[PDB]
Amino acid sequence: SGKRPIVANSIQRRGKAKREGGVGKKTTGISKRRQYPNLQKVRVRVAGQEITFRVAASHIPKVYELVERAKGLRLEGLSPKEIKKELL
């Protein structure tokens, strides 16, 4: 999948194989395929309870930056789901 602040989905874009020179010519052989986002689990505490974020490495910090603003946010009550949701 892709979920989280990352935004990033999984783009399907083809890889095309070539034999050649480039300074004599260059020919081909092509087909479809998909690239994935570097998703990664990210644990973090925030208030009570743990909480996790299947997110790309490219936005891992954004999570900790996101927890920073959460501390200043008056929040509580058992709700791991609602935590994450309220965490924007």
Query: Which of 56, 63, 83, 87 is close enough to bind RNA by CB under 7 A?
Result: 56
Query: Which of 14, 25, 77, 88 is close enough to bind Mg ion by CB under 5 A?
Result: 77
**Quick count: other Cβ atoms within 10 Å of Cβ 6?**
21
34 belongs to the binding site for RNA (CB under 7 A): yes
**Partner in contact with 64, chosen from Mg ion, RNA, none, beta carbon below 5 to 8 Å by kind:** none
Ranges within 6-25 binding Mg ion (CB under 5 A): 8, 11-12, 15
**Number of shown-chain residues binding Mg ion (CB under 5 A):** 12
CB of 71 to RNA, least distance (A): 6
Cα separation of 88 and 49, whole Å?
A: 17
Residue 69's nearest CA partner among 82, 85, 51, 88 is 88
Residues 6 or more apart whose CB falls under 8 angstroms from that of 29 comprise 16, 17, 18, 19
